[PDB]
Amino acid sequence: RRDWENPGVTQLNRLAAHPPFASWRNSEEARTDRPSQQLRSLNGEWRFAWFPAPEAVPESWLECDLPEADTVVVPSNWQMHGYDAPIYTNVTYPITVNPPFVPTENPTGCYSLTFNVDESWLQEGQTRIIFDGVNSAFHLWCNGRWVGYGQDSRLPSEFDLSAFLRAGENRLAVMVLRWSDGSYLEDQDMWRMSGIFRDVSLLHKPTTQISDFHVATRFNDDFSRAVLEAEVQMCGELRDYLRVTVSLWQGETQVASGTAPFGGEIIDERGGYADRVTLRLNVENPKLWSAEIPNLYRAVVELHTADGTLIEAEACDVGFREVRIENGLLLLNGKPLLIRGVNRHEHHPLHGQVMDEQTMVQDILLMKQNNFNAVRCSHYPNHPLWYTLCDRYGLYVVDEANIETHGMVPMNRLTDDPRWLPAMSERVTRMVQRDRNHPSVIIWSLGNESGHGANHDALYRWIKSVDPSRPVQYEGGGADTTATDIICPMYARVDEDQPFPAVPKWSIKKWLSLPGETRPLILCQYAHAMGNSLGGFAKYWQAFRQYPRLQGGFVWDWVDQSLIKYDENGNPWSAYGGDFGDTPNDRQFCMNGLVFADRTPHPALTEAKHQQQFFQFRLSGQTIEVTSEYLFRHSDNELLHWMVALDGKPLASGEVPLDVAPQGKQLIELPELPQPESAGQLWLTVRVVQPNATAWSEAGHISAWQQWRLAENLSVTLPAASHAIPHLTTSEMDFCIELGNKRWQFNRQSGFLSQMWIGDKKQLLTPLRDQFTRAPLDNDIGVSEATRIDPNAWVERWKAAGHYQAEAALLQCTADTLADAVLITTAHAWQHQGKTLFISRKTYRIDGSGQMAITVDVEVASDTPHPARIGLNCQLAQVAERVNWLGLGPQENYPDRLTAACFDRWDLPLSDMYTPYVFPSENGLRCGTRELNYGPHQWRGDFQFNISRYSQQQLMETSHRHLLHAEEGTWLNIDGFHMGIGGDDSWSPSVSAEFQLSAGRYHYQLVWCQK
Amino acid sequence: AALLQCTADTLADAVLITTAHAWQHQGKTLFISRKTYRIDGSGQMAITVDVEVASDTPHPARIGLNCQLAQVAERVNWLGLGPQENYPDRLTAACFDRWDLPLSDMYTPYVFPSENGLRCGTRELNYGPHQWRGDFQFNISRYSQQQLMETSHRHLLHAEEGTWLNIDGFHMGIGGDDSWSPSVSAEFQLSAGRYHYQLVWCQK
């Protein structure tokens, strides 16, 4: 045997790891990166049968196809084809913890393929098969004979089939185990799936071949000169006539070249490597690589006889860059980086863990368009094309070993155990051997959430010895252990310390200066974008810009891991943990992305775009100061557009070319402006626009923006006198006010506005009443469960306090006739089990112009948990197509997540006012609004609001968006005040004190009128 | 102050006065103050104040009311922070309790006179037969702000007739990280744009 229950056996007959090969036989095709006739794909239609345990597989399958097998596409994860269920568990392992054993019932995928091999491949050289990703462990047979075995789901397994194959038809048999001892090191927080989920290929190499090659680029002090050093190793027939020529190209121009015979310098008393050769090429004024300008060269490595026969050629894209930590700072090409990063899992809602070029490209475009410059491979080596794309489009990468043992207790139980050193070593070393020549990889990581064990210290040192060009990081065991060159915490807050024993999460600003500490700090995970979140994001960015050693971080995370399911009617819907019968499970914790699984953005993405801008601005008088945060390029594809508007109405605008050097400034003086007609606030908005398309953005792409309030002329102009006075009519149960075509009815038993008529049409489906709660966000719930309440979560604190069930008690309701209006005065108390939680006192003044001015003053008991909101709500009878407001927008914005929003006049379709979070909650709020228009109504004031076809009650009771149903009418929530949403993490309260409603007394006012 | 509105209405059990004023300079409106005074059968006068402050004017030193009371009394008694002078950014040492001091203890004799003697977090203030209730900051003494500002040495101050009372809904921090560059932290500047406060003046 049971090799899959033995961590001492992680492979049998597997070839050594090495950088990407294609064995070209023509150097120009190697130079151009064209396809090679010696590298074939075996992707396509294969045969597959599912078995409940390896003991159930029939021997016959080795020799021939099973009649009951299906033909399926490979690569794939078998759960995506319905064979068995994917499981969504976060920390707790999906199997009983009893290493190194796995369950007797262990889903086994039997894959097979009959394929052709040309005779020419068998007349010479070696033919190997490569499986880029097999989850979790597998045995391979060729033509009925056993070839070998492999573990590690995330790196390639290569086997020499030379002696097993025959001309023409051949048949592969692959028996894939879902669970193996490798599973104890694969406990990442993601769907647990299995299968042959990365490409399968066949590669022909000559008998005398390039078996490995390492490319290094070293520089002089100002990066005006470099030496490219390429060490090449061969296997096979070593003879004096062999040579290696390494040539370096910048496009179609050859910039350098060197040729040498094999035989490295003397290494020790026994000599040197007669099978290795190191070529050193001098390159003057090299064009440097960065995420800003991903300049690349092409190195071609030719193995050939001295007299001119090319044996084979391999090759790679080279990016000239130096990565080093000096004086506490991580520098790239001598300048300190500011990492605008994101963690990105390999996830597709239809294909599972199978990646494709299109999806990868789509992700890199969106990342770049949203001002990200870096990505962490949470938490494993990625599909090979990912690196190629990050080298070409330009993203800094953290390459991470596939080692995560989160569910152990304590977390380092395996990583501190020498018996697991061998299995861990292969996960680290084979990754470095495969990905060490990609310029996009700038930092190596030892894996994730596996505590800190002595195995990490050994491996940290192994990487530092083999590759001195990149720092090594690892967060386990407290984020600043001896196994990391970078303090790289997860979810450490900006100012707040969380002093957990043994592994405290200090405020990042305090962490940098602890006694004796000198390393740079880059969070490996920060701001958990689960549901309506990212509150407090701007606090991180202000700190990063202020403190040199705070060099950024990687947002958690890029894309929700939701999967598509289909209902009885055949309509697709987004599913999360437990939706496949999987249990135990961790429900919606698999959805923490800035974008939905189909790549549609969540609102939080625009907040990240704005805080991660590369241009900063300051305003002084008529002067705008632009500062560039690029380190290497000048602003050669950018112009500044500016607009001054009065409450939404444009008054003046222009454009100015931007010419700012990296880290430089440009002062721009705006024109003499037209002093405004009417009253209101003037606002200046500026945007940086890229006129020319790029490889990653369209012409006109906006990359940065900022707004400022300019002059304000408060209105002192009196409204005209009205030719009318509203009339009051009273009964024991109501106060009715009439003014022309308008009527208002106040219920004297409840003390609320129960109905309004315009003309003779009823406007309300439910009365206008105070609201102190919200349908809880993922951050309000945290890890709380019905089955296991977490009393410290906001939602539980509100529930326990009775907020959700408190009943309004009427303390007063009066009506008075004024000179030109009717005034209704009310007071209510909300209580629970004898405790008065809130007191609401209001006045409603309806004048002869038909406007109703509502004044609200609320008292909140200092000892009840601060409430989610202080506002009013009602179900309007009308359903209108559009929503138009003067306030922050156009996207959803909350108090602690509104920096990206701009004050202007926005107008959207109603549905755009609802955000379809998979797990429904309060959503769609827009803050800082001065006027709201819907149908015939207009509300004016200074408030926050949401408007949609779904009640807060319905959102709190429904757990999946596809189950919500539009209600009659439109539910309007208009808040004087609304609590922050939080998001530094999604398992402990994270709303900062300044965003909690703790003032005790609150005042707000609204005018509701028609038009 | 330029008057925008002054009306009176009678309600079932009270009289309501409504006023609106604008404060201007060189044709710019700096602040707009809207108030209601509601006088009831109990003799209590409830004052509601809603102020607007133009966004482009420097944030103001305070948002309150003031008057010169005709009489002088021996003690000042309040339910709020104290007993000593305290300001928004310098009130951590003060305690919420019922305090009672002689009127002169309500004036701090800084050699170079200025605004002084405020107490914050006050829910009730008693002076002679008067009582003010709300959630405000106040100072009370024999010297007008005008006098303090015009006088550079404490020995030249003279007690005015009566008692000057400044009652603030909001008051700016005093700063002090240095005394040569603005040092009041943003969180203590009156930059909210719209401010509301309410007070009840009654007799005791």
Place this chain on the structure above:
Amino acid sequence: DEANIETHGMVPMNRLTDDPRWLPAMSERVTRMVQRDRNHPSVIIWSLGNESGHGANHDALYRWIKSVDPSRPVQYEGGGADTTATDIICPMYARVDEDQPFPAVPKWSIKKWLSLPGETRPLILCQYAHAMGNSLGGFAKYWQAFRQYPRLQGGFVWDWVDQSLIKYDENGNPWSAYGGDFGDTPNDRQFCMNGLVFADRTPH
């Protein structure tokens, strides 16, 4: 214990302290202080003076002390507070969170200053929170930071007692005088009164 050397009014501030011809006079002010006070246990830190920029004479005297008395650290604020003549980062009036990036001698936020690239020393402000008049606004912000950051080890408030002097009026009664009140000019008026206590020891 601080040597009597302050040349604040020079332009630039280190004009004399960077001049070897002034090394002898400066040296006597440091050496004679150490010879006098080195046996007192209350003295825990020596200081090279105040507001005299940073000149090579400071570096020479810093080493002299280190050599003769290894038992006490040496500090000195001039020249940017973190020069080679100080074992403690000891700025004056650096704020808690806000940087003041003056050219050549910036005053960083203290929290940020601790972590600048390559910095490892403790930080104790030689002067902070200027208690001139109605002041000390934001004092709590410093103490919250000192308790949260191990390397922020406190500071010396500026300052203990107002430097006012007594003058007598026509009637013979005393009053508190400041700059210019003796016919002295030029003068810096009330900037001599920055204490937590009045000159007569009554507290502010």
